[PDB]
Amino acid sequence: SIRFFKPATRTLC
Amino acid sequence: PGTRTSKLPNGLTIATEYIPNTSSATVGIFVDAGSRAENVKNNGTAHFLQHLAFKGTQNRPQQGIELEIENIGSHLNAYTSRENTVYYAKSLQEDIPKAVDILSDILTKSVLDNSAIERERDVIIRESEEVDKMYDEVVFDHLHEITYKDQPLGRTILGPIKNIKSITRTDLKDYITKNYKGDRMVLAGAGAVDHEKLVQYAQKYFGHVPKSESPVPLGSPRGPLPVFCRGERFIKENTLPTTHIAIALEGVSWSAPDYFVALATQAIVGNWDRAIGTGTNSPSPLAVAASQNGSLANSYMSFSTSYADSGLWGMYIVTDSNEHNVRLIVNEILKEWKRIKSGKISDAEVNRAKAQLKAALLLSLDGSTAIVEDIGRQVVTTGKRLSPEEVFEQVDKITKDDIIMWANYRLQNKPVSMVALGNTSTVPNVSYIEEKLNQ
Amino acid sequence: ARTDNFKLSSLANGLKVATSNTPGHFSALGLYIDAGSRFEGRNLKGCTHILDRLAFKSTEHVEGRAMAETLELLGGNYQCTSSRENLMYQASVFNQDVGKMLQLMSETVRFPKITEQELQEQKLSAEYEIDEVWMKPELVLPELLHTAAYSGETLGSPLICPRGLIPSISKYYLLDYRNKFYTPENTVAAFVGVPHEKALELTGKYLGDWQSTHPPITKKVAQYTGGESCIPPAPVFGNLPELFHIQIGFEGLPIDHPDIYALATLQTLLGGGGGPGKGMYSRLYTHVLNQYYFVENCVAFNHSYSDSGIFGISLSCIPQAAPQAVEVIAQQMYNTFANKDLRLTEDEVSRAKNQLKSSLLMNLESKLVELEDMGRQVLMHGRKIPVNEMISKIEDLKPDDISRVAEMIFTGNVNNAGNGKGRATVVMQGDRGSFGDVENVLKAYGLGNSSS
Ligand SMILES: [Zn+2]
């Protein structure tokens, strides 16, 4: 990565 | 010009931002659900649902959804977080209604075939085994478990293997029945979109959704505030090459008045990588120390997580399991937070941080999808959307003083929770950390 | 032109100034230079890459440190990149900062200092970058493809600079390159969300007095030759499965060619790969990925440039299957026009058409993408094709159109300015033998052209 914010999430990616 | 809003009789909110000179758009349904709406034996359902929503509905068999979307060149995706469940679509403007139709169909009229539910238990397991390979992911899940001890926010999104094997179609249908209420969801759209028409389609395809009997505005408090619990969990793993540590303190929620100030402070500390540096022309005393005499770690990353009623703010560290004394890098980090608390920061670094912050929150709102992301998440967790211009204002007004104040409030005589995975022998205690920080 | 609010004009020194769209939450701007690795010849090899890695360092009027700090203060969302056909400096900034960003951009474009130290750093750093690049098949195969397709000339002139040639890139050669390509008449200043009037004002202020060096015109047309090449199997890493790779192509079309939309539709129809809408209903998926799993990847590619292009299919498989790779690919190409029983269907074509319109339009939702596409279009043929026109040309495509174009390409019947051969370009990584008599299989399927 490089610089900011961070929450968890699961995706049907 | 700005974000248009309308509310359906069943409580559903429709929020929109038109983008000139476009012929495509994004529409998404946001539901205030996620894993924080489950319980211990329930844990993992919302995510399980997301998987099944793509397996077929009362109106369209699985392959039917796929082929239909692919023929008009649209895209369909979904995700689950601890706070919500989101299903969304990208399509040409001509297909917006088709999009709303399909979204509502997958969300509320999904088949949930017993055969499907059993085959899927394996996929979800496989998925679980993959997350276990992402050390950062692992560390933060444990951190949530101990920090929000025995609370909703303390459970993971995927849930325990135990639950993945035991979830039943009944569990699934109950979750849907309990949580899917108009007053608990937002239909957000941006791009080549007509607000009035979208509200109509909303009524047409989502009108049938039940209103909660005890409706509450999307912003209003879920109930008893989550409580931050100090604690520590050391996960010894001598086989791991790198060690991972996360240190947190109670942070800020989405609507907190000091929300942007908290982000500003995070940015002043910033990140650092042993190979790359800071990605800043001028590194902080912390970054310099981290890199000196052999390096004190592989990398460190300041983080901040927010929820409607709570938040976590802290540092995430990565060290060489065989080369680093974790204590040393922790000391430097605490030294840096104290520097801020003592006001020993320059106008320049404060300005650097505000600039970093504005770009990160604003220049990133580029396509309709990112904009729907912002409209949707803000309204569903907060009840409103601060506009880009409003956010700019909020960041721009931050002062050196605001930051010094905030740090002295949140990082002095407050509890901290910590998690360490890998070579734990060199990692300091949570009481060690508070002692040095408050000192 | 009309709805995009696109306006174009020139300064007296020839610098073209292009603007589009209307005021928004923020703006985008950039300088585009008609340069790239295809103009390096053998004498300036590696100069394009080093100059772009040197972007935004010290200039005659701005100390290196101040340049960096000011760019941070502007949000730090800026970059310089280059390719075979382009060299660009771009950024998105808040509306009130357009002028300051433009000033810095013209400082690094007109008055770079390029000190001994700065150059030494980028050179030292380029060696390590090349070493990494050579371990990535996704980067390496396409490189080999171009080199072979044009026999190392222009479009096939190395995009990855040979390791041994880096230390000899001197300030002298960088200045030579700059004096040949960094002239106002070879540059475009583009802005999105900035009023044309304002843009002319700012451009004139920072670039108006810039004068040309009137260098010797050294721009050769691309001559497709086609050809063959094979590098050794990659090293067997950890748990990773050993794979062989092969790319097969033919001369494609120039990006402004009239059948370009048919050809991109063909590309989409083939699709391939390694939620819904991800192209799982494309031919390469259905006829290859789903049929053979000794195939880990299979996709169609379409490299299109100003005067030529390379069109074809890429395939990655298990060492054991290599012997069948060529035939598999040949069949697919054949089945797009020469198989009466697998003619391109209305459904296939209609879906491909919508997926093409879709990805173009969605990509264009991004200001930086609108910006880059505008800059390059103006740089190339001095006009910005209006989106409406683009969509129309796609929607009017009919299955026969796609079939005609497929045949033209695979028959080796393209007639670009460079008057290319109709010979296939076949490039691969693995044991050469494992692939068999490549040319024979292709001829067996009527692919290519053997008679001039
Ligand atoms: Zn999942």
Cα-Cα end-to-end distance for chain A: 19
In angstroms, what separates the C-alpha of C279 from chain B's closest C-alpha?
7
Residues 343-362 of B with CB under 8 A from C: 348, 351-352, 355-356, 358-359, 362
Q: Which chains touch C (3 or more CB pairs under 8 A)?
A: B
Angle at B310 between CA B304 and CA B313, to 5 degrees: 25
Residue with tokens 């809003």: B5
In angstroms, what separates the C-alpha of C98 from chain B's closest C-alpha?
13
Q: What is the CATH number of domain C221-451?
A: 3.30.830.10
- Select from C219, C436, C405 the least CA-distant residue to C326: C436
Regarding whether B301 and B162 lie in a shared domain, the answer is no
Buried residues in B238-250 as b, exposed as e (16+ CB within 10 A):
eeeebbbbbbbbb
Q: Is B125 helix (H, G, I), strand (E, B) or coil?
A: helix
What are the tokens at C416?
Answer: 């670009």
Name the H helices within C114-243. 116-133, 137-149, 171-181, 196-207
Distance CA B31, CA C407 (A): 50
Regarding whether B259 and B154 lie in a shared domain, the answer is no
What are the tokens at C187?
Answer: 């540059």
> What are phi and psi for residue B44, nearest 5 degrees?
115, -10
Distance of alpha carbon C17 from the chain centroid: 23
Q: How far is the CA of B36 from the centre of ligand 1 (A)?
A: 17
What is the rounded radius of gyration, in angstroms, for the C-alpha atoms of chain C?
23
- Select from C56, C345, C449, C102 the least CA-distant residue to B281: C56
Regarding whether B255 and B169 lie in a shared domain, the answer is no
> What are phi and psi for residue B187, nearest 5 degrees?
-110, 110
Distance CA B368, CA B152 (A): 32
Q: How far is the CA of B129 from the centre of ligand 1 (A)?
A: 11
Q: Is C16 helix (H, G, I), strand (E, B) or coil?
A: strand
Expressed in Å, this structure's resolution amounts to 2.7
Q: Which of C65, C93, C265, C365 to mutate to test the interface with B (most CBs of B within 10 A)?
A: C365
Regarding whether B310 and B172 lie in a shared domain, the answer is no
Regarding whether B236 and B206 lie in a shared domain, the answer is no
Which three-class secondary structure string do you get for B23-36? CEEEEEEEECCCHH
In this complex, which of B22, B71, B389 lies closest to C365 when CB atoms are compared?
B22
Distance CA C148, CA B140 (A): 49
Q: Is residue B226 part of a domain?
A: no
Regarding whether B287 and B266 lie in a shared domain, the answer is yes
Regarding whether B250 and B145 lie in a shared domain, the answer is no
Angle at B4 between CA A13 and CA B9, to 5 degrees: 85
Give how many domains chain B has, as a whole number: 2
Regarding whether B301 and B321 lie in a shared domain, the answer is yes
Q: Is residue B268 part of a domain?
A: yes
User: What residues contact residue B384 under an 8 Å CB cut-off, 6+ apart?
Assistant: B219, B378
CATH 3.30.830.10 boundaries in chain C: 1-214, 221-451
In angstroms, what separates the C-alpha of B9 from chain A's closest C-alpha?
31
Regarding whether B129 and B78 lie in a shared domain, the answer is yes
Q: How far is the CA of C97 from the centre of ligand 1 (A)?
A: 43
DSSP string of C20-70, one letter each residue: ES---SSEEEEEEES--GGG-TTTSTTHHHHHHHTTTS-BTTB-HHHHHHH
Superfamily of domain C1-214: Metalloenzyme, LuxS/M16 peptidase-like (3.30.830.10)
What are the tokens at B46?
Answer: 């919302």
Distance of alpha carbon C343 from the chain centroid: 31
Regarding whether B285 and B200 lie in a shared domain, the answer is no
Q: Is B292 helix (H, G, I), strand (E, B) or coil?
A: coil
Whether the Cβ atoms of residue B91 and residue B73 lie closer than 8 Å to each other = yes
- Select from C7, C11, C35, C60 the least CA-distant residue to C210: C11
- Cβ–Cβ below 8 Å for B301 and A1: yes
Regarding whether B268 and B139 lie in a shared domain, the answer is no
Pairing of strands C16-20, C187-192: parallel
DSSP string of B389-407, one letter each residue: HHHHHHHHT--HHHHHHHH
The H or E element spanning position C187 is strand C187-192
CA closest to B390 among chain C residues: C25
Distance CA C350, CA B242 (A): 51
Flag whether residue B270 sits within 8 Å of chain A, measured between CB atoms: yes
- Select from B380, B245, B381 the least CA-distant residue to B310: B381
Whether the Cβ atoms of residue B113 and residue B50 lie closer than 8 Å to each other = no
In angstroms, what separates the C-alpha of B160 from chain C's closest C-alpha?
25
Angle of helix B169-179 relative to helix B114-131, nearest 10 degrees? Answer: 80
Regarding whether B159 and B72 lie in a shared domain, the answer is yes
Flag whether residue C283 sits within 8 Å of chain B, measured between CB atoms: no
Q: How far is the CA of B83 from the centre of ligand 1 (A)?
A: 16
Distances (CA, A) of B403 to B242, B251, C386: 33, 14, 48
Which residues in chain C have Cβ-Cβ distances shorter than 8 Å to B352?
69, 72-73
Cα-Cα end-to-end distance for chain B: 51
Q: Is C104 helix (H, G, I), strand (E, B) or coil?
A: helix
In angstroms, what separates the C-alpha of A1 from chain B's closest C-alpha?
10
Question: What's the CATH code of the domain at B337?
Answer: 3.30.830.10
Query: Residue C324: exposed, middle, or buried by beta-carbon count in 10 A (0-12, 13-18, 19+)?
Result: middle
Q: Is residue B225 part of a domain?
A: no
**Identity of the residue numbered C17:** V
DSSP string of B191-214, one letter each residue: ES--HHHHHHHHHHHHTTSPPPSS
In A1-13, beta strands by DSSP E: 9-11
Q: How far is the CA of B305 from the centre of ligand 1 (A)?
A: 21
Which residues in chain B have Cβ-Cβ distances shorter than 8 Å to C361?
22-24, 92
Domain range for B194 is 3-219
Q: Is B110 helix (H, G, I), strand (E, B) or coil?
A: strand
- Cα dihedral sign for C174, C175, C176, C178? positive
**Identity of the residue numbered B172:** L
In this complex, which of A1, A5, A12 lies closest to B77 when CB atoms are compared?
A12
Which 8-state DSSP code applies to residue B40?
T
Distances (CA, A) of B79 to B109, B416, C133: 18, 30, 34
Cα-Cα end-to-end distance for chain C: 42
